[PDB]
Homo-oligomer: 312 residues x 6
């Protein structure tokens, strides 16, 4: 079940085959066609108008540059183009038809009343065109390349945290020092660094572009509960594994007995952990809000422990 | 070691560079060339004929539409095309030469006796052509895009199941109720939902297209054994991680002692688990059978436990 | 360090050798001597008067029947007997000298100013007499046989309880019943009996006679704490091991899932346990109070547990 | 932070949009342009010259075939091409500007003093050209396709090994044999095979091409330490999960008691494990050295155990 | 609740005070009195006749030597003696009145209709006599010294066995031998001896004399069950702690791998254990049967274990 | 198997029945008889002369006061007495015949060639006499009351130590203190006292009198080994349970992290423990040496542990 944008949200239509994007302008001379992506060209941005009535479940595609709406039709030339009136004509309404396999993030834009499918290709002219819908070719598939969106907030569902694995890792055994009897002080220092892991995986909602850079706190098991470690300021990449460092730091002293040599074993539970979350985004142009649901996953550490003994 | 189809199995030849597929028809006028993929165009489907004798280890490429066989040759024009006789001529026999790195699912189709390599490109004409085999370019590489195949059956090798991790997850501690002494009944309810995981990973045999939708039971650890949970009816995607829900349900009652307050702790072992399997497929056009070996992998839960105590 | 009674507390003086008790009456004719024990003969009861001044650390022995006080002297006949005035004369003051080995609950009654030791024997006349203190014979040793004392109260020091051993004992595994699927009710019953143990061991204070019958609550480990089980009404014997029965009783039901056979494992921690205590006693004749400190020890059971599972 | 090659290291410049590579030759007639990749064409190889002085942080791009250096300029025709003098002119210096999202392994090659960006496209002529830098299109992005590099050595950092999970897997319980009493010999055999896993993941340094085939020892937990298993001779693929087999082999005998039936339980700890490492590479043409840092990850087994008991 | 013998069972009546035994003969001249114990003198043996009717709950004391029955009476001289007719006269019936404290294994023999108590003393004549029952002296107390009884059988209640403690004791770690690689044989020997413990404690039934020598099997925990170790042939002493030796013996071999040094750890669970039992006895003179219930207690060992590993 | 003294070791012969001791002097007038025990009267001390030749396995009883040797004979008056010549006559040789049950620490002194048994009684004259050996009475039994012996040394067999039980006892949980963040010092104090236990039980060798006071170190489990705690200076009593106190003392500090509240859990393993030993004694009069083997037993504590954590 593919994510279709609501009405206030802008996007590009990237063709599978052409690897190029639809434009709609007023001038210059060819008013619609294909172009290499330019993020700053308003030309290439479109939003949808949700059909109602008999058009419920269909969509018109409104140019942001121009305000006009796309059309696909067979007899009258040209077969595709732009036009006023927010879907006045039956030519402006489109069924979104998701593909399968390697086309499962792609979809057709079929206009049913004319039995016509939008076409995006570089091998043949015109590059942006249509085709009889019954004959399905790969160059009829499109994907959404959404407008740049800022990740305002990550809110974890900590109650539903989960430990998927757990093994003790001894950070520093050694740290054992002596002068048999009375004395008074033996001070101990702990500085050990573990490479932890972090992945923000899509689950539902808005499709954040893979690779998107952002910052956030990352989950942590305390002793009986999950919490957010706000200290960790690494740049994450949406949907990819990142690594970060966690340094464990402690100082503690001992000696006060008859005649003993102190040992200090500093130990941690490490293992895989995961936590659901919801991200909150907004359009950088507009302020328009969406959310994304996700599961966060990471190799982590918890329950720092220092154990003190004696020998003779 | 790449998977080469046996004789009854159909496929497209997608070019690395052209991102387009070979066709062979009788009419219209140019009888072989390149086209965007159309699953329903018989045109684009081919099977192999396994060379024997001096041609052992080589292959002819028979058009499904036409019945003719591909050829590559140097002096006589045109250099490539179609012809009768199931590899009558030495021009019809091809060595399949797998690439490396980003071309490791791709291969060349070299015809040795002419020292010639098949070419698939969009930058230069003719698009489908050949080239002297000693000069290796990226546009000589092809991959198999097999015909649509139905996944008839998944059969797990349960004896070889494996737990890769295990930690206790307490589903519901709380569930503790009281009225000090005699009474009679304290009933308890359990409804807790864990997000489980599922991945069907290729290992050997037929190369199922990544993303392929299907349904099956998914493995489970019982107490001393692996078994299949037939309840779970989610749509899987071959070679990708999917998530599903497992709800744990129980009702149990207690009180019958001197003077105690009952507690009920409902607990599960969760962790990663994996199980080999063999899938059985068949051509949707023909009925032709293959198998695929795979390892299934998943975050799961097992050994549901309820523990009852007392307090004063 | 032997227990010497305070001034309000009555006792008999049993001789090691004679196995007979001192009497002091007014009539009949021989006013002091030895007799077989008769609990009701006031004759045989004595209390001490604690020397002060130069007599500090010494004791006079006052007859309860008569009110007079014992004397031991050498030149004047008779060497032992009775007399008025609560230790008026130096002849009435005695050093209590504990024995060793088999005489460590026994002691001499030496009157230092005359250098004379009290004698209790059946082999030679007079049976109750004295002897030069420097020549030590076994028939100069005496022990206290205290008046009958009622055990009014046992107060345990529960904070200082201790588990000396712990092993799980499965009371009833079996208790597993089935009718594969839906149904609704599977009820389970638990009745299992463990032979527990109980010993009230002297530690300090008043020397309760070994074998003394009484009743009390007996300690128990709850989950995080020691408590007194008031239910257990067995007759104990001071300083001896007793056995008692503890029956564990529970009823609980289950079934509510897809298709499972329920198992129920009822289990306990058993092991040795011990708890300090103070007993409070009083004279049955008089009301005079003392205490005894002790450690209580017992094989016991704790943490009753019922664990419910499933099979197919 | 993208990996930029030092001066002795050769590469191709693959365009995002064109999916074609820059060439620079002396003859034939068009001396620079785009071509499909040919690994053996010196034509397509370039190294960088690190700007210094006012050009510090910028780079010239020297042709390996020709020795000349690339230029981008606006007024004078042609806008791009080749020229003598290792960056004599300001036209030869380039800022490398990494992309984001799907372009994060790609970068622009902007020549600042002319305000001009290099262009690689197939939709419009000339295919290799430039464009005003302020108007950013997708066809200005390039990635490095480095020269073939041999993996000479893998050196693990064994002290920093880590167990991320651990569960016991019983390989063979059964293996229990009998003839009640005296006899003498009961011999036992163990042959059990576990499918292990191996992944060499990039972390820092030189960007080894994903899929690169090589051989190496793979880490192992001994009892108190990580070590390299040199036995395992599988072909690995850089940055991808591979599987391999580990067979556990043992023979041991028993019987010598009063009257017992022997049992033998052969058991292993399995679980996920990971270990940092540094790889050492060198150019196949030149011998030029680089390194790559990585974390190795794998499902593994450790601590083989045989436990012998008795029955009657 | 003291053990009173049934009618076919013989005994001596030992006085607390006299430490001497009642006799009844025909000749010589004084026909009843006291004597030092002689096991072979029929003289000193008596059985009881259980009163019925109005004499229910009372007992006559029949001489084994003579067949006559004891009497106690006040007015007529002599006050005690012997007479024909198995309790014809009211003078022959006795209430058995258990003492307390140090007299709790002792009892009075009071003849109620005359209000008279039997007397056993050495300090005054006649030594065997009676006294007005209302005046209670210590020399009226008697205990049973039963006839010699053979212990024919011990039958344990194994289902009700119990582990009161359990800790692992490593018998022999060391036992580790090497010659790095191929070889073939490494044989291992185990001979380790633990001092075990054994106590047969009275619980109910016939009062076996403390110290009684006998032989029997002694309990043992197997793996899931208690069993009798028939091997152990030590002489036990009823009601006392005995020690015995248990030697653990095993031989096992190993080597068959790539390149490893074998270690062998031989280990046992030791701890306290106890088991109810019933003993079966019979008179050595007569064959007359009784039983005794008891709890057996012992420090023991169980679950012998050998664990084999590897090093490099 | 009773302990019979070697030739240099002195003793008294205490009669079971008489509870009196044999004397042999030169004057006054009756030269042998019975007397109440006087430790300082040389009169009452005897050693044995081990028969050889035909007298092997028999013993003469030499008076320490007099140097003469005991005799028992029938026809000639008096039947018992004293005489010169260290067993010149057959009248001076005695078989030691251990009793059973309550007489198992007692024995007869039978002189076989006259068929005569030594007699010790208070009920009949002469008190010290003999009797025809075939008629066995209780007043023919004797026990050894050895001369006062000093306990010079206890040497434990530490390698053969054993833990019979083990449970963790938390001494002080609480000890948790806070001031959220930076600060620097949180110091912790531990003072907790456990009542331990100690019993020196006879096993073999010289029969140390029960109750004998002495001092020694007492065993202790360290971490991997038994050792002697020389600190513990309580007075022990041979063959009886004693109690002593063990105080555990420690001081340790902590804080040095981001923002945590420290907790400190001080814990010990407690449980029963036992260790074989050999004691070395010597005569206080003479210096004559013996040994005693024994098992020492005690409730003890070991492995002191302090565990430090964190909270927010
Ligand atoms: O899916 C689009 C296909 O277009 C086909 O081209 C058409 C052309 O657009 C139209 O004008 C027509 O009259 O002739 C052609 C054939 O119907 C291509 O053949 C095909 O490759 C697809 O791109
Ligand atoms: O790998 C195929 C290469 O083809 C080359 O083009 C050839 C052309 O096909 C042929 O007719 C010849 O005579 O001239 C060209 C050069 O040999 C391309 O140059 C190359 O880019 C590859 O596509
Ligand atoms: O410890 C008492 C001892 O008494 C001794 O008897 C005395 C007797 O009492 C006294 O009158 C004296 O003059 O003669 C005896 C000897 O001194 C016993 O000899 C001794 O057995 C103890 O009982
Ligand atoms: O990023 C490169 C873009 O080039 C544009 O084409 C230019 C052309 O190269 C130049 O000669 C100019 O004078 O006219 C065109 C428009 O400025 C394309 O329009 C664009 O698609 C990009 O490829
Ligand atoms: O419990 C027996 C007591 O007997 C008392 O002696 C009696 C004696 O037997 C009787 O003949 C009587 O007439 O005179 C004595 C006093 O009543 C003892 O006095 C007492 O010691 C007990 O043994
Ligand atoms: O075991 C000793 C027994 O002695 C018996 O007394 C003897 C006495 O010693 C002796 O002189 C003899 O002639 O007459 C008595 C009977 O044989 C006692 O009868 C007995 O009680 C035991 O003490």
């Amino acid at each position: 079940d593919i994510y279709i944008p609501p009405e206030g949200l802008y996007f590009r239509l990237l063709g599978f085959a052409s690897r190029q994007v639809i434009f709609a302008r007023n001038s210059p001379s060819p008013d619609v066609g294909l172009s290499p992506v330019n993020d700053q060209a308003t030309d290439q941005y479109f939003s949808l108008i949700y059909g109602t009535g008999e058009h419920a479940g269909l969509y018109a595609i409104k140019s942001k540059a121009t305000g006009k709406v796309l059309f696909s039709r067979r007899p009258a030339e040209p077969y595709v183009g732009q036009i006023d009136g927010d879907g006045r004509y039956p030519d402006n309404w489109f069924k979104i038809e998701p593909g399968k396999t390697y086309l499962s993030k792609y979809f057709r834009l079929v206009q049913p009343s004319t039995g016509t499918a939008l076409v995006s290709r570089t091998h043949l002219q015109p590059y942006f065109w249509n085709h009889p819908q019954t004959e399905v070719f790969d160059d009829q598939y499109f994907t959404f390349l959404f407008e740049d969106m800022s990740i305002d907030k990550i809110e974890y569902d900590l109650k539903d945290g989960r430990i998927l694995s757990s093994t003790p890792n001894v950070l520093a055994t050694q740290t054992l020092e002596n002068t048999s009897s009375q004395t008074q002080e033996m001070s101990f220092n702990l500085s050990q660094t573990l490479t932890q892991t972090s992945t923000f995986a899509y689950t539902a909602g808005f499709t954040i572009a893979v690779g998107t850079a952002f910052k956030a706190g990352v989950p942590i098991f305390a002793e009986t509960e999950f919490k957010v470690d706000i200290s960790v300021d690494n740049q994450w990449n949406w949907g990819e594994e990142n690594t970060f460092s966690k340094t464990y730091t402690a100082t503690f002293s001992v000696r006060a007995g008859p005649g003993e040599t102190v040992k200090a074993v500093s130990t941690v539970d490490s293992g895989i952990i995961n936590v659901p979350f919801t991200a909150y985004l907004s359009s950088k142009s507009t302020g328009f809000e969406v959310t994304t649901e996700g599961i966060w996953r990471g190799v982590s550490s918890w329950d720092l422990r220092h154990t003190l003994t004696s020998v003779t």
